[model samples]
Each structure stands twice: as C-alpha cells, then as structure tokens.
Target: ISGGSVVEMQGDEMTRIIWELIKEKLIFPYVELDLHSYDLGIENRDATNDQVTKDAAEAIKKHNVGVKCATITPDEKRVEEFKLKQMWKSPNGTIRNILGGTVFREAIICKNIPRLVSGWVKPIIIGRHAYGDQYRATDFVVPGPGKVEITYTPSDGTQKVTYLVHNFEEGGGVAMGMYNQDKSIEDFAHSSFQMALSKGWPLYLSTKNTILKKYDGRFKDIFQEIYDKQYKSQFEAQKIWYEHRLIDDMVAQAMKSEGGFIWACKNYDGDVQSDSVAQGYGSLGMMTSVLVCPDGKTVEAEAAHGTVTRHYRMYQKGQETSTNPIASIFAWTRGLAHRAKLDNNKELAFFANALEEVSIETIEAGFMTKDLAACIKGLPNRSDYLNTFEFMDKLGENLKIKLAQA
Candidate 1:
C-alpha cells in the first residue's frame, strides 16, 4: 500500500527507453504504483530551467520515496544545442541540494558477473558524504612560487591554526581551502548509520588522515563522535562494527573483504572511488546510486550512468544493440523497497525484494545483457541474454512464475 503510492522521475535516451519497458513489464503488471512521474529529459530540464528538479525532489519529500532514470547534465555543447535557457546545474545535484542529504553508491552482485575483485560475493555498499568538502571548496592552480596558508579566523582576535596546503613540491599545482560544517557531517553520520542498520551491514568510514591530517581528521572525528554519541551501542548490539579506516588501507581492505559492508566516503573520494568500484563490478548496467536522508523517510535512486544516447542512436540506425537494464530495474526496486521499509508496508516490501532478487537470478541463470554475456563461459550467443526490452520481459515472466507459485 505504501509503495503502491510513490513518485517516479523519468529521463532520456537508453534509460528512458528502458524505463518504459520496466513500467510495462516489471512494475505495472504486478503491483500498481501510484507513480508520480516527471520527464527530466534534457529538453524538459532546459525548458523548466531545472525548476522541475526542485518539484520532483519536493514530491519525493512529500511522499517520502522516489525512483529515477538517469538524465543528462548539460555541458556547453548541450547548452548551445538546446539553445534556449541558461545553463542549469545537474538535476541530481539540484535535488540533493533540496533534499540536503548524502548519495550512497551500491553495487549489485550476480554470480556470473565477474568482479575485478573476486572476493566481493555480496555487496560492499559505499555511502559517500555528498556535501561541503573539496567539491564546494575553492580550488585553484598555483601559477608561481608562493606560500599558501589556510586560516579559520573566528570572530575573536585569535585564529585557528594555519595549514600550509603546499610545502614545496607536491602541489605547486593545486591549492584548495575546504571545510565541512558540523551539521552536514552529523547528518552524513546519521544517514550512514541508518543505512548500516537498515542494510544490516558493518559500517566503515574512510579518510586519509595520515596524509591530509587536519582535513580528513575532521571526518574521522565526526564519525567517531557520532558513533560514541549514538550508534556505537546499536552497532555493537547488532554485532556490526562501526569504525574509521585509513583511506588507502580501507580501499585495499575493501577490495579484499567479502562484502556485506558499507564504506562511508568523503565527497572527493566518494566521487572518484565510487566509479572505480562501479567499473570493477563491471558495467554501469549493474551499478546503483541512492540519495539517503537523515530521516530515511526520503530517498531517490537511479543508475550510476547516464541515459545511453549513443546506444539509442545506434539502435535507431538499425543496429542490434545490447544494453543492460539491471541497474535501472534495481533503481526502481531499491527505491520502492526503502520506501516500503520506512512505511511498514510488508507486501510492498516483499514485491520490491522479489523484483530485485529476480534481476540477479535472471543473470545467474545464464541469461544476461551483451555486457555480461561477453563474460560468461565461452562466447555467449547474442540470443542468450535478452536485449533491452526483452530482458525486462523475461525478468517479468520469470518473476510472475516465481511469485505465482509462492
């Protein structure tokens, strides 16, 4: 009942194409979603001057749930090509700004889909703190020999300690003054802790305090303080560990860990590392992104990649295209499932869980997309894995049969 009522954001290209099939095949047939839809197409995004982004975010806030398809964030070329309104910011960024929360990246694991790191049999979910660090900082390239000192001048006469961002060698290249507010950091902590509790995971936060010292040290401190203040007892009660990890070692260890863990990352590391983890898990097809709030009442899920316009164009050329829909499909299920959990809707939760399980099951059943079909034993026939729409149909068929029996 809870998730039968939910908001859905639509977008462009391959994902948009896949979005339609998902609705027809996977979503509409089984459970009726009271889907509040928005077309976040690049053209529409331009037309609304991105006001649509705010409206959509608010819809999810009101409903406390949302599922999304990937949309294009316009660049200069897109700006001129769209040819009307001023350049707008990324829809995800804009929505996150409205929602005021963190975006967490999680990977979907299928037995047949090979991970670059073989040990990750389960999902190593990364919840990246999406606010107020290097991303918001003023970064500049130092042109000449100069001394840069970072000072936090309080209203009082005394200033905080000065940080020499560059000594002599390492960064005559780039200098930046970055900071995080306690409030944002605290919200990030709550979101990560709530995620760990909800996902039943041992949460780990990573920072490069050994190198960055003061900068990353704050992240470590905030997490520790939050843990001691609130989550440590719950984590221990659940027999799940919550600890800060050195950034380099954390990644290396994460590469080795067998998953069922959440590695919370700061903004810069999250942006860079989530991709490596995404690629390592293989296709953008299997990567899922979620924005979680401190309340856990609101969330927005989407594929880690954009709408595959190039693939769509190729398909238009009468080329037989092989695109994976796993990520897009999961975007729906995960977002809905989180909503179900929050609202205490068991049936809706079951439906969401079943759909997601089927996606992985279908892949492991030796039926997959072109991206994954390549990795399977021997040369898989193009016929083996379902194409864009066909795969969704197959998944729906399989799920229907599975559910009907149950």
Candidate 2:
C-alpha cells in the first residue's frame, strides 16, 4: 500500500530475534510492505568486512527511510565468540557519520506506566550534537612535569598560534585536544531547530560557555547566528524560540519542569543527560530515537537500547524472555510515518498512527512486559506480565482487533 520502500537493517543478539518476530507478527501481517533488507548481524558484518554497514547507509541515503535493529559493537568476548577479523565500530556511529545528522531521543510516555518523576507528563526531547567534542579527542599521559601546549599552523601561511593547555608540576597528568567544525556545528544548529519546529516546541541549547569562552562560545554563537538568520522568524510565527542556557542551569530546570521542550545538548551533556532524562521518564526501552538530516527530509529510526545480549542468553538457555519491544516497534512505525509524509500516502500514515496507538493502549490497559511490570512493583510471579512471544502475540491480536473495529 506504500510507494517508497524502507532500507531495513537486521542486527545482532536477542534483538535480532525480536526484530524478526516483530516483522512477521506485527508488521507484514498488516501492510504489504517493501524493504531493502541488509543483514547487519555480527557474523554477517564480519563476513563482509563491514561493507554491509556502508551499503545499508547508502541505501538509507537513497531511500530516505531506514528502520534498523540494534547491532553488536564487538568487544573482546564478542569478537572471540563470533571469531571476527576486527572489532567493528558502532553501526549507529558509522551510519551517523555517513548521514551527518543529529539524533533526537524522546520518551513514548504511557498514561498507566508510572514515571520516576511524577510531573513529566510531556516528552523532553534531546537533540545531541554528535559530530565532535570529547568523543573524538587526542589524549596522552605526560611522562613527568612538563608544560603541555597546543599549536595551530594555518595552511594559508599565516602565523602559527599557540595556547598553553596545561602544565604538569608535581606529577604527570593527562592532556588532550578536542575540536569541532563550524560547518558541522551549523548543521547541528539547523537540525536542532528543525527538530524543535517539527514538534512545535521551544528549544534550549546548554553549554559551558561561561568558562570556555572561545571553545563553547563558538557553539553558542553559531546557534545564535543560525537562529537569527534562518529560524528566528519561523520560531516566532509558531510561538516558539531558541535560547542558550548554562549547562548547570539547564540540568536544574529540567529536573523540575513538566518537560514539553526540546533541549539541544553539547556532546558530553547530551550523552549524560539523555540517560538521566530516560531514567526519570522510566524504562530506557520506552525511548524512541530518530536521526534527522539537516534538510529534515531523511530520517533513520531505532530504539535507544542495545542488542539485549543478556536477555538473549537467557532465551538460549530454554527460558522465556520478558524483553520490551515497544521502542523497536516504534522504529518501524516512525520510519514508515516519515515515509508516509514523503510519499503523501494518507492511508499508510493512518496505519502507522493506528499501530502506535494500539501499542500504547495495550500497555496502558495493565498488560505489559516484565520491565514495565517491575517499574510498578515487584513481579512476584510470571502471571504478573507477559513473556516475549506471548506479549507480541497479545499486542498483535489487540492491535488487529482494534483496527478492525475502525
């Protein structure tokens, strides 16, 4: 029933298993879907020397919609278990590098699910500036007491500039150089504003500009310039605005507010605060993550959680899994919703909306998985909630039955 196809990527561990079940039970049963499937499973990644990730990224670029499952970013044991050639970087990181976008994570709040913080009735969307900063830094330990300095020589034959980073006196210490590009920051600004506008919410950028004038100030200034030149008028028209906040102030404000705004975070704060926000709202599994390109047309959606290897191991041991699939289900829903907008397919769009509503309603009706059941109180027995396959089956039946009523 849809025109444009999704670039579908299958991933690793227990999530890989869940991904298939979700497709067969919830997805293919409802829509005559079309997907360009790429196996991003760890073994497959090793087989292709990770070319599949690049190919999948390229397909998402071509198709403008990507629905992905969580994948394994191999460590020592994983590498040995899979007998991999090399440790692959995170597939999400690789895909983001290719897409050049910002990832926004928002909680899928359910009325019945109890939030850790009671007042968070609305979603606090987090747009993380993922391009640079500490994630990509050069660090070294000093041998002994010595002055550590940073020097920059412009390629245009300008005079070299030097700045003293730190000086070790009594003992050896650590020093590092971190950097960001103006263009990348500008893209980050554009994406952040676009995301806020898309949600029709105000935007706030948090930074430590009070201390690092030249460094963090650049982020503040770039976002301000872009807001003034590009988004300010649009924001005003929508009764929304962009403002910069001190990192500490932002954290303090976030703790007490009802959380209906989009918060743009620098790399470090985004990494830390998104988790904080996720926990406060409840389970991390309820977090739906989307990567929107600067132009706001292309998007790749997924769950904020990982492969659930621990749960998968339990499943392998002939035991049932109570793993949550809400976020992963939303991955497909959100991707298809974006595709609907792109295709202008009203029927497809309506179907996507219906799917999400059913999932939420199912949870709200006191039927949930173990994680959510635990959130409310101790799960004394299996009767307290549904198992992995059982929940999916019930969810599917309820979703189909509900749709049929319409």
Candidate 3:
C-alpha cells in the first residue's frame, strides 16, 4: 500500500511491551511501511548517552512523521535505579526541542466511557506552546531592600533598555522574569490554526492579556495578525472561526460548552490545563498527543501518558495486568494517517482510520482494559475486562475481520 516512511521510536516499561504487541498484532499485518526505527528505551538511551533521542528527532525531521511509545524521564530516584551517567532530559523534551512545534493533546472519546464533564461529548484539543515562557524563566529569591531590574541589551548595537521589575519595601519579595519570542509565538499560532483546520474545529487562543497587556498582548496580537493575514479566509471557508479569549473567561466558557474546539494555550496554561482536561476526560490512557510543526507538514504522535511503570512492576512479578493500550495504538494511527496524507495513499489512509474505528468499536462493544472497565463499572470484576494480551488479540482479530470486509 506504500504507507510511506515514518520515524518509529520504541520506549520503556509496560507500554514498551504493549508497543511490540501493537505493531505485531495490528499495524504490521495491514500497512506496508518504511519504519526508521530508533530504540529510545531507557537502557538504550543510557547506553548512547541520550544521543539516540537526538538521532530519533532528526529522523522525524527528515521523515516528517513519527510515532513514539511512552519513554521514562529519569528523576533522582530513577537515576539511582537505572544507574545513569547523569539525569537525562526528557526524551519528549529533547524531541520537542529539536522539532520546534506546539503539542496538541486530544482525548479519544468512546461513547460508553463516562466523562467527568458530561457536556464534553466531543474532544477538546489543547495546543500548548511548548517553548520559552515560565519553562525558561529566571526566578530568584529577594534578599533585602533592593530593586529588581531587567536589562535587555540589543545585539544590533542599539541602546540598552532597562526597566524596573519590582522594588522591595519593608520586606523582600521574590522576582521572576519570563519571555517569549515573536517568532515562536507565530509558530505556535500557525500550528494551532493548522490543527483546528485539520480537525474542522474553532480555535481559541487563551491568555491573561487584560492584565499583562504588553507581554500577553503580543501573543494575542500575533495570533490575530496571522489569522487575518493567512488563515481567516481558509477558516471561514471551513465554517470555523479563530478568536482570542481571556484565560479566566475561556475556562468558564470551556466548562459550559460541549468540547469541540482547539484551545491554544501559552506554555504554563497548557501545562496545567492539559492535565486538568485529561482528568476531566476520565483517563490519560485515552489521551493522544501530536506535535505539529509550524509548517504544518512534520508531526510526531504519542500517548499523552507516561510509561506505565507501576504496571511494569506488577508484570515483572509475573502478575496479570490489564493496562490500557488504546492511546499507544492511537499514536500509530495518527502518525500513519499523517504519513498517508503526505504520500496521498488512500489505501493507507483508510487502513489508519479503520484501525482507529476498530479500536473504539472494540471498546464500545464492551471489550476494554481494566482502566476503562473500572470507568464503566466501578471496581470491575475479572470478567468485566480482558488482560493486556487478550485486549490486543481482540483488537487484532477485530481489525482482521474489518479489513477482510473492506
């Protein structure tokens, strides 16, 4: 079917085991793909001193499509456990760094699965501008009565600009400085607009611009400028609108409305809100994340959740586990769909959609993992759900039946 080349990144833990089952049972049987495989497992990462992550990112840039499994980001304890040279940066972070883009996390909705927010029948995609803001901010503790000032020296020999951030009174107060580049904000806007257009969803850029008039104002202005200059007509033709909203007002509006829009968030809001939205949707297992480059061509897809280390621990003891693989499976579908679009292979496109439909239809038909089973029936019995292997095999059998009919 000529499914096209894709950067396939293998990862760690329970999801890693499930990753193999998914490829073997589901993907390989259907689409003929050229996979640029990279082992991003924790051990392999350590062995390569994390050079593999960089190489994987480069492969994605070259291939324009990547499907990644959940990998472990070593904490202090993990460093001791894995016995690594140093605390490696998050592979996702490294990949995102190399691939400058915005991460849009969307919930995979199954009709039977109950959402905390009952109104959210459709998925609310959150596009987080993952570059410089609070993430790259410099913060410091104030000692005594001293003024905190920020000095911006122009690289082009222009006059240096100095501004007083704060003045310490009777007591000292902490001060922090954060910044975002216009170029990065423009990239974020393009990615957000592209995602909305692709999904046929309205786009909302949320910010606290009413307060931080100049700082947040820039974000608002850039989005509007880009929208008017580039995407407005395209969005209008699609019958979808792009607008700006106050962060506070947007949160309230989001709560009240049915979830069918893309919320473009600054770095901090996206970080906090994406988790909140994931919880509202029931489980991280149902969340799929896609990083769209500003050019709207390159993309990398993965589950929004981390490697199931807890489930891996139990599996290590030879215990029965039913960890959800739906999101991981989606990583392949979404990534392959993009590959299909790039190659204009309708057969591969149909295969990707068929797999997604089969995955959801399997769940809707009362076959799911323990997590989703619990969602339906609190503390589900053994018979209520299938084990990990059983679930994969079920999906495999169903997909086989589906494609046979197709």
Candidate 4:
C-alpha cells in the first residue's frame, strides 16, 4: 500500500523509543510512505534554537499530514536538567498557532477495560479552540484601584471602541482581559463542524452567553451562522445536528449522555474539560489527539499525554517498565487514515483500520500494558501485564497474523 507523504516528528524519552519500534514493526512493513522526518528532541531543539519546531510545522502544511511523537515542553526544572537554552514554548502550541486549527481529542475504548463513567460506551470527542482567551490574557493585580477599561482601536482609523471593565472603590483586586479573533473563531467553527460531519455525530458549542454576552456570545453567534450558511443541509442529510449549549448546561448534558458527540469548547473550557474527560474514559495513555485545520484537509495527530518521563527514568536505570503505547500507535494510524482518505486508497485505508482493530483486540485478549492491566485488575502485579517491548512485539505479531489472514 502506497500511503502518501507524512511529516514525522521525532521526540523525547520512552515514547520516542516506542515510536521507532512502531514504525519498524507495524507501519513500514505494511505501507510505504514518503516520510519527511524531523528531529524534535529537546537537545536538538536547543541546538537549532527551536527552529526545527517551526520547520516541522511548515512541513506538515506542505504535506497535509503529520504524526508526531510526544516531545518535552521545557519548564524551569527541565531546563535545569537538560542544562539548556531559554525555556522553549510548547511545541504543540507553536504548531497549532502556525497551522491555525482546533484540536480534537478522543479516547481509545477497549471492551474489557471499564470506564469511570460507565455509560460512556462510545468515545466523547472534545474539540478545543486553542488560539486565545485566558491563555493569552493580560492579568494584573491592582494595588489601589480606581477604574479598569478595555480599548479596541481600529486599524483603519474608523472609530475606537472602549468599555469600562471594573471600578474598584476601596479594596485592591485583580483584573484580566482576554480576547479571541473573529477570524480565528470562524476557523474554529469550520474545524469543529468538519470534524462532527466526518464522524457522523452531533456537534455542540458551549459558552456562557447569558453572562458574558459580548465575549462568549460572539462564539455562539459565529458557530450558528456558519452552520446555517453551509452545514445545515449536510447535517440534516446525515440525521445529525449542531446546537449551542450554555457551558454549565453542556457539562451536565455530557455527563448523562452516552458519549458519541463532538463538544466544541472555548479556550478555557477546553483546557479544563479535556483533562476531566480524559480521566472519565480511563487513562491519558488511551487518548488520541488530532489538530484539524479549518479547511479540514490538513491534520496533525499525536498522543494527548506528554512524554512519559517517569517511565523513561525507570527504563534508564534498567528497571522493568510497562508503558502504554496505544495512543502513540493510534497517532500513526489516524494520520495514515487521513492520508488514505485524501488519496482515496482503499488498500492503505484497510491497513490503517486493521491496525486499530488489532490493537484493541490485543487488549481485549489480555495482552496489554500495565496501565490497562491495572484498569481491569486493581493493584495489578508484575505478572499481569507485558513490559514496553513485549507489548510492542505482541502488537506486531498480532498485526501480522491479522493482515496475513486478510
């Protein structure tokens, strides 16, 4: 199978080790790819002054597909440990900024593993608008305050808009001003709609429009406008729909529902809710994330979890480690599946689908890593699960048998 060109980013720690094994054992044997490899390891990023991250994002734009391994986002401690250059920005953030998209994270469900939310038999996919609001806010502490205001000056010099945020009389307080671009909001709506349509599921955009009328109402209005103008007929044909729900109402509805819908959240809501949702399904190790651009033609897939630093440390000391590689493996399958769709290659599509099924079937058959093993049997012993290498090899063997039978 000729899988099309894909931007492959190499990364740090234990996941990087598994990334290589996955390609050697599972990916390369079945499908041929014009792989554009970029080294995004911390040391390499420091050496290149983080130019490599920018280049990798550009490569994804050129190729229209990327599968990235989990990389280190350096903090104060990481900088001291690596003895580094300046603390680099999160590679994921940088890439998303360059690509201008929404990140959709979904859980990989296996039948045998129990979820915290027992009714969620299917996956709850969350589309996060990752551009602005709160994340890029200007916050300050007011020592002795009088008034705080926000001003928006037009570039065209038509008129300036200003509003009083607060007027503190006696006590000192705190104030924050956050913003989201209209253009970015439109892009977020398009990406969310595109994702929902592709999965044949209903889409919900949640906001606090009643309270923060102007701020959050803009998000609600843009999503509704775009849906009505373009996606209304398409959604109706599929028997799916798009609706706006208050943030509080949406959370309550999501908890009671049986998972199979797309929840589009604002920047802050997404930042908080994704972790909550990830926990509901089980482990972050079982979560897959993909950044879908506005056009829905370009995508970059990766594991939602970070580099397994603790596991890597254990492995370095020759200690036994059982790290879950399911999410990382799905990064490849999802990216290749998108490529297959773009090229209309049935053979490549079959290969991607078979790999996913084999991964889940392997887990159901009790050949799984420690994280999943613990999910099934609380306080799982060493004997209960395979270590990192053993699990990869088992997936490879299972994939081979399944593909041969096919």
How close to the true structure is residue 183 of candidate 1, measured as C-alpha lDDT? Answer: 79
lDDT by residue (1-406, candidate 4, tens digit) is 7887999999899889889889999999988899999999999999999999999999999999999999999999999998897999888888887887788887788888888886787788999997888766789999885999999899998899989988999988999888889999999999889889899999999999999999899999999999999999999999999999999999999998998999999877986888888888877678878888877789999876888889999989999899888888999999999999999999989999999999999999989998888888886346789998899899999999999996
Mark the 10 consecutive residues where model 2 has the least summed lDDT. 375-384
Model 3 CA lDDT for position 7 = 91
Q: Write down the worst ten-residue block by lDDT for model 4.
A: 374-383
Q: Encode model 2's per-residue lDDT on 7-75: one tens digit a residue.
A: 999987888888998889988887776789999999999999999999999999998999999888889
Quantify all predictions' global Cα lDDT against the true fold: 0.80, 0.87, 0.89, 0.90
Q: Candidate 1: misplaced stretches above 4 Å? A: 1-4, 138-177, 197-201, 377-381
Using all chains and alpha carbons, the TM-scores for the candidates as numbered come to 0.86, 0.92, 0.92, 0.92
lDDT of 3 by residue, 1-406 (tens): 6787989999899989999999889988777788899999999999999999999999998989999999998999999998999899888878886787898887888889888887887889999997778766779999888888999999999999999988887888799998888898999998889889999999999999889999999999999999999999999999999889999999888888899999999988987888888878887678888898877789999876888888999999999999999889999999988988988889989999999999999999999999998888787347899999999889999999999996
RMSD of 1: 3.5
Worst 10 residues of 3 by lDDT: 374-383
Q: On a 0 to 100 scale, what is the lDDT of residue 115 in model 3?
A: 87
lDDT of 1 by residue, 99-128 (tens): 767888877777777767777778778888
